[PDB]
Amino acid sequence: GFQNLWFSHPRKFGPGSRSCRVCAGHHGLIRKYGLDLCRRCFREQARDIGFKKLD
Amino acid sequence: QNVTKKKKAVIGGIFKAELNNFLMKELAEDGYSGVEVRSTPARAEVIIMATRTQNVLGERGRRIKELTSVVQKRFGFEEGSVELYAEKVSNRGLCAVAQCESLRYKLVGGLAVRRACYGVLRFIMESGAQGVEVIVSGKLRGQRAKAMKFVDGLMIHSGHPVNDYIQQAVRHVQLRQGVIGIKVKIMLPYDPRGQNGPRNALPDHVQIVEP
Amino acid sequence: LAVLKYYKIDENGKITRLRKECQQPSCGGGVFMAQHANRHYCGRCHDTLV
Amino acid sequence: HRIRLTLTSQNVKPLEKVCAQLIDGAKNEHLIVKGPIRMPTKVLRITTRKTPCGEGSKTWDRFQMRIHKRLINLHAPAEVLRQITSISIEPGVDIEVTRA
Amino acid sequence: DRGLKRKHLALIAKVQKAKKAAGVLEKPATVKTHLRDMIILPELVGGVIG
Amino acid sequence: KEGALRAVLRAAHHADGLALHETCKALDKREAHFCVLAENCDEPQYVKLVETLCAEHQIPLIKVADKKIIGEYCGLCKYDKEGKARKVVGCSSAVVTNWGNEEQGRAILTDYFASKN
Amino acid sequence: MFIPKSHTKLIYEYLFNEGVTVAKKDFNAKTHPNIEGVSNLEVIKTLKSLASRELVKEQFAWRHYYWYLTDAGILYLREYLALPAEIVPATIK
RNA sequence: GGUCCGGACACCAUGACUGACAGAUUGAAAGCUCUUUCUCGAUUUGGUGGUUGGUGGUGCAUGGCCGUUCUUAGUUGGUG
């Protein structure tokens, strides 16, 4: 029934198992060091996280 | 817990970023300016630098208590392990974020864009900034969008000294016609005491000791 | 209003249950089982008895 | 026993200030202090496309974060460490003690 | 070895039932299925599947 | 005594022990302390039916003629900032599995309906 | 939303006790991290109803709903759950 | 192809309304629907307003970001 059909399909791996922690998007996701931020999320939050553009 | 130092630093950065985002969304009317996170192993103190500590704290420190409890619950801290202090920003005119929020307030109120940005420019310049640049872009007049720029004083754009001397802020305003973007840039003054601006002079400014 | 249909009032005054009552460990007296053509179905549980 | 003080930071100036404070405390106490041991710096690099879409020339932002680590070896059974550790603090630097 | 799934076993049972409930002269009733990854086993030969 | 009953069943409802369909199952479990009934119930088979189980399970009863008052006696109606009963529903029967407020009045009504029976 | 009365009771009890409530915007999580028994969807919908009725102040940031109890909310909640007027949430204390 | 409402809040109503054995049904152990009558019982259900969601349209309504004009040396007041 509904209980065993609403989200039956597993989501343990693949693009659909992850998302940016700000916009919840599955595209262009950085997973290095557990950032879990999209490539657009990170460009905005980098200064706060502590990533600087040295060279 | 046992975690690599790289992951510890990354987690600290992520926590600081999320806290800053949440606080700027919550205490915007409170004249929020910034947040500093001191995450010592024993307790995590969080300094909320704002212009109105009275409003930030609220009645008998109830809003601050709510915020600390909420932060603890959100980030899975222990009761009393995370704690917030409020703090009053010395010079509100030299803080880009506060000026951006004030311009936001004026525009939502309905003040003419030219009048509002000129008032903000005058206040910032009187506050002691070397230079100021305010840009307001969007559907200001008519269907076609335009950008209005107001510049006073001297302002630098390129090089490392930008990171030390320039303070920027960006905000958005939702009016009937659409979204209007506000950008504020302030060039802080050379403050040897290190209170109103960077302690070190500009790299190309050679100062002579009078004989 | 079928609640009254699972109770037979004897002329003397006491009552007798007209439906096979359930025997599940959790749900017991009170809850009744349906009078299906060939089976009897617990409503509060599964407990199908043929 | 050997007490290991490990100091980590992302900025060199506060880390060196804290190190110098701790060495000064140990020397003042007259302890067997082992000079600041400088671990190789860890550089975490993230290279990303500047554009939020797929249009334009392919330009990349090269963000990087640096982590610096310092070790201090102490031969101190007495109660002096708590004093030295507690007196000297500085934001941005995280310290921890191990009983090696 | 990893194990056939419950839907697959149900399909096997349905096809076997359809084959059983049909005379040799005529063809078994169509069994419609979405399972395109089901293995064709000797239990399956003789039936007709949509 | 109506006030004492109201005070008791208010806390009963708050504790979620206040309960036809539910009342039958309640007195089948015998957790019921008493049942409040109405004489306006036109159903001849239901009227006697309910007291059959009540007496059989030894759960004496209180009878209040009309049903709209017992409907009011639950807190299930919306008020005009003054407790104004509005849009009440028939409550031909009810059960109290757990006790409520008005402790002294609760003792009083327990003694009353245990002695007069 | 169709929610059991007991589930609403636990949600409301936690909300009154704490004065604040946090819930990830994850309609599918079956266990709200702080509240036991109820699911994230039930908590989200209950507190969204409270916000709609103006008993709670709502904020959103980074896929996390944040909710703060108001004065109308404290009045309504004390009346609903039937507490003594002396009890108050930890925030007010 | 099929399922759920995850349609807040307000107003007006008419055991209001959930759920699941088994047969049929379905790609389906989907109580989706039809056979069957059991079960929680004010949360729901219907309508009217109002919301909510949308990788739906419009980048020729917009914000932010990026690319390019343009990696060249180019640009602007004040008082005359």
TrEMBL record, chain A:
Which domain of life does the protein's organism represent? Eukaryota
Please indicate if the UniProt record lists RNA-binding as a keyword. no
Primary localization? cytoplasm
List the subcellular locations. Answer: Cytoplasm, Cytosol; Rough endoplasmic reticulum
List GO BP terms, alphabetically: cytoplasmic translation
Q: Can you provide one Gene Ontology molecular function annotated for this UniProt record?
A: structural constituent of ribosome
Keywords attached to this entry: Ribonucleoprotein, Ribosomal protein, Zinc
The cysteines covalently paired via disulfide bonds are C20-C41, C38-C41
Subunit and interaction comment: Component of the 40S small ribosomal subunit.
Name of the protein: Small ribosomal subunit protein uS14
Q: What is the lineage of its organism?
A: Eukaryota, Metazoa, Ecdysozoa, Nematoda, Chromadorea
From TrEMBL, chain D:
Listed InterPro entries = Ribosomal_uS10 (IPR001848), Ribosomal_uS10_dom (IPR027486), Ribosomal_uS10_dom_sf (IPR036838), Ribosomal_uS10_euk/arc (IPR005729)
Q: Which domain of life is it from?
A: Eukaryota
Matches recorded under SUPFAM superfamilies: Ribosomal protein S10
According to its UniProt entry, the protein's GO biological process terms are: translation
Q: Which residues form a coiled coil?
A: none
MF annotations from Gene Ontology: structural constituent of ribosome
List the GO cellular component terms.
cytosolic small ribosomal subunit
The answer, when asked if Nucleotidyltransferase is one of the entry's keywords, is: no
The alphabetized UniProt keywords are: Ribonucleoprotein, Ribosomal protein
Q: Where is the Small ribosomal subunit protein uS10 domain?
A: 4-98
Presence of keyword Ribosomal protein: yes
Per the record, the similarity remark reads: Belongs to the universal ribosomal protein uS10 family.
Q: What is this protein called?
A: Small ribosomal subunit protein uS10
Q: What is the organism of origin for this protein?
A: Caenorhabditis elegans
TrEMBL record, chain G:
Q: Where in the cell is it found?
A: Cytoplasm
Please indicate if the UniProt record lists Cytoplasm as a keyword.
yes
Give an example GO cellular component term for this record.
Answer: cytosolic small ribosomal subunit
Keywords, A to Z, come to: Cytoplasm, Ribonucleoprotein, Ribosomal protein
Classify the source by domain of life.
Answer: Eukaryota
Q: Where is the Plectin/eS10 N-terminal domain?
A: 3-93
Which Gene Ontology BP terms does the record give? cytoplasmic translation; determination of adult lifespan
**A GO term for molecular function:** RNA binding
- What's this protein's family per the entry? Belongs to the eukaryotic ribosomal protein eS10 family.
Protein name (database record): Plectin/eS10 N-terminal domain-containing protein
The species this protein belongs to is: Caenorhabditis elegans
